[PDB]
Amino acid sequence: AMELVNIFLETDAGRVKFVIKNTDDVCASELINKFVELLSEYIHIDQSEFYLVVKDKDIFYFKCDRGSISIVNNEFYVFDEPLLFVKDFTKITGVEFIVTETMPCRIIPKNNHAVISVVTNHKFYNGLSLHH
């Protein structure tokens, strides 16, 4: 079981996750193409530039630059912001990207979908915490 933690669907019923099951014998590197295929329903992969953050126990970062996929070093964003999700829907209205200072995006949607951009800056502990 793996899911994206930085890209979601906006639907009539609420936020829907990108989830792939039956992955026990594969690492994130081995199925990142399948997540890109899922996203191609909703955006023009050949024109878009974005990041994919996959959770499978650990977190794994990838970049998809006009269809060319690469590994990104671990950036330590929590991708925690307690999100509400729904499991079923009838209409897609948009695609939601969680963007960061180091992970911008350039998205060309299909089918007149909205592009939603939400920022996160929260990172795991790195040896120093600051009272704000």
Q: Is 16 helix (H, G, I), strand (E, B) or coil?
A: strand
What method was applied to determine this entry?
Answer: X-ray
Cα–Cα distance measured from residue 98 to residue 22, given in angstroms and rounded to the nearest whole number: 26
Task: Give every CB contact of residue 27 below 8 A, 6+ residues apart in sequence.
Answer: 56, 60
Burial 114-128 (b: 16+ CB within 10 A, else e): ebbeeebeeeeeeee
- Give the count of alpha carbons within 13 A of 1, CB side only: 2
Q: How far apart are CA 73 and CA 71, in angstroms?
A: 7
Structure tokens given for 99: 């963007």
Q: Which two tokens stand for residue 9?
A: 């669907």
Residue in 68, 89, 81 with CA at minimum distance from that of residue 5: 81
